[PDB]
Design a protein around this ligand. Structure first.
Ligand SMILES: Nc1ncnc2c1ncn2[C@@H]1O[C@H](COP(=O)(O)OP(=O)(O)OP(=O)(O)O)[C@@H](O)[C@H]1O
Ligand SMILES: Nc1ncnc2c1ncn2[C@@H]1O[C@H](COP(=O)(O)OP(=O)(O)O)[C@@H](O)[C@H]1O
Ligand SMILES: C=C(C)CCOP(=O)(O)OP(=O)(O)O
Ligand SMILES: C=C(C)CCOP(=O)(O)O
Lengths: 233, 237
């Protein structure tokens, strides 16, 4: 009855302002996560601790002096964000342990052996969108969503949840066009995330959910008539 | 020879305190890192966690059997070491270096750690940074792998020219310099309570070509004096 969960950068950071964390949201979300008894792995996105320097330094992209310096900066930044989520989890008495993708062997897939040892021993491993060395000439950025896809394939969990700062997948950006309709249900019969969630669904028995991280208690409404967000089925 | 391949350990004795008011010696981290940024072929930096990082681990029962207190303690100890380590990485970034933290707690372990990711970062031109840390030794046991243990392993993989350990005293003395006003500095020690660490630096000599050094981190410009006769410190060679 395992759950894997991603905390979206859009909801724990202000995506428009470099290194701006939203501490309340982090705490508010972690409080709900700590009550989830079968939560086995947490991932988080980077928002303003990721995307802004990545774009400025040429990540992902060819290796060169600027992108090599950017590699160290973006990872350091993502570590700083990660420690705020780790501190909140420790406060709620969880047993988190961060396992950064940057520290794993990569040979086209990442060697998640250390993360699986942590789950087996009863920890909740925490990982996050990160830089990695994709090949001799290229640095890549592996996103929180890519990590979720990988966990979904490896663990075959019962449920996978993504928290973002809107209520679900809509017909159109609910922030620009105030008309947009909520797709409360998508049948296997923002664009890249949607594509990853659909792909994942074939490994996730009981559905992949997008939920508003600003109302994290909605996670407890999964499977109930009061649920608000998107289920991919 | 300014091009000597060096691995270096920044001792918890010099970048931490017993104070209840702060964790880290920020000035000491910065002046050391300033000297490090000028070393041509520094390929790996490791740092320690000091004594109350040691005491705090011991008070969780780490290293030791798995139980609730040790398991909670595992998460806290690792988080505290990561926070210390982020202060070193920050300084390294400000001084123009290309650091990448690679924690032992994230490495594959099967009886030995797989250091492939540190080795690949060195070949990619980064300076990996690691630190004494907790790990899962087996299903019922949590281990602690000290900064000195990491230095011994990286010496064996890398075969560097020199290995440098920074602490808060001028070098190896005949007696604890802090307890004995008549302690003599031993400047050159033929490799053929610092007892343990001194044993470990002698063992490392099979893997370090040109000497293992103990230098006061409060005066890190001494690092740049290696090989000179104005050098203050101890060499085991
Ligand atoms: N004979 C001796 N010569 C020199 N120092 C000694 C001797 N005996 C004891 N010491 C003490 O050893 C201390 C340094 O060793 P310590 O284990 O603290 O090293 P460290 O690498 O900084 O530790 P860590 O990184 O594990 O925190 C010094 O503070 C000094 O007081
Ligand atoms: N069709 C859509 N439905 C819902 N949200 C959308 C849509 N198109 C764009 N968005 C935007 O996507 C954002 C969430 O994306 P993003 O920040 O990339 O997710 P994450 O937090 O996982 O990184 C929301 O802020 C929303 O404005
Ligand atoms: C390292 C960077 C640039 C962040 C990668 O993470 P994500 O792509 O998962 O972050 P959000 O999408 O959730 O912001
Ligand atoms: C958390 C701890 C104790 C790491 C151990 O490091 P040392 O300071 O090199 O002995």
């Amino acid at each position: 009855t395992m759950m894997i969960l991603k905390i979206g950068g859009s909801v724990i950071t202000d995506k428009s302002a470099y290194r701006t964390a939203r501490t309340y949201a982090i705490r508010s979300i972690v409080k709900v996560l700590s009550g989830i008894e079968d939560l086995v792995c947490v991932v988080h996105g980077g928002g303003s601790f990721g995307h802004i320097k990545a774009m400025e330094f040429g990540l992902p992209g060819p290796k060169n002096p600027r992108s090599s310096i950017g590699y160290s900066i973006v990872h350091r930044d993502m570590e700083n964000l990660d420690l705020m989520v780790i501190d909140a989890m420790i406060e709620m008495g969880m047993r988190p342990i961060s396992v950064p993708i940057s520290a794993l062997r990569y040979d086209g897939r990442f060697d998640y052996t250390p993360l699986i040892r942590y789950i087996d021993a009863g920890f909740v491993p925490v990982s996050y969108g990160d830089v990695y060395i994709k090949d001799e000439h290229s640095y890549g950025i592996y996103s929180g969503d890519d990590i979720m896809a990988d966990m979904a394939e490896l663990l075959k969990p019962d449920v996978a949840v993504f928290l973002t700062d809107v209520d679900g997948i809509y017909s159109k950006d609910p922030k620009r066009n105030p008309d947009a309709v909520l797709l409360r249900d998508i049948d296997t019969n923002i664009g890249k995330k949607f594509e990853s969630m659909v792909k994942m669904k074939s490994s996730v028995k009981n559905g992949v959910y997008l939920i508003n991280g600003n109302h994290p208690e909605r996670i407890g409404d999964i499977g109930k008539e009061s649920f608000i967000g998107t289920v991919i089925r």
